[PDB]
């Protein structure tokens, strides 16, 4: 709370790609929608994506946004990115949610 501020909140089903099985799987193990933030650590000017399931508050994503990230807006309601360890996808609950999140992501990627 002291070092980070939320710069957006968006509704999405958070998924990760199981490359061994070539299938998307629910992040955290159970399907359903989460409230997904981008948090800005204002002191170090770093950003991370944190999402929590609406129903039971489980943290299902907590990943750094590195400078230079390629954010792929595959469709108007499904966006995705990768790191060295995982491929992440957000199935947004609406186009408005996708726009809110992408706008904050693109902002983070510009100021990083």
């Amino acid at each position: 709370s002291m070092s980070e501020q939320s710069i957006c909140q968006a509704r999405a089903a958070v998924m990760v790609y199981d490359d061994a099985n070539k299938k998307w799987v629910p992040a955290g193990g159970s399907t359903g929608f989460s409230r997904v933030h981008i948090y800005h650590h204002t002191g170090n000017n770093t950003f991370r994506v944190v999402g929590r399931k609406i129903q039971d508050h489980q943290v299902v994503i907590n990943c750094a946004i590195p400078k230079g990230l390629k954010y792929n807006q595959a469709t108007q309601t499904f966006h995705q990115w990768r790191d060295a360890r995982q491929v992440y996808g957000l199935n947004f609950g609406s186009k408005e949610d996708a726009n809110v999140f992408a706008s904050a992501m693109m902002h983070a990627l510009e100021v990083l």
Partner: peptide, 5 residues
């Protein structure tokens, strides 16, 4: 990047 589910 992988295709959408």
């Amino acid at each position: 990047x992988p295709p959408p589910x």
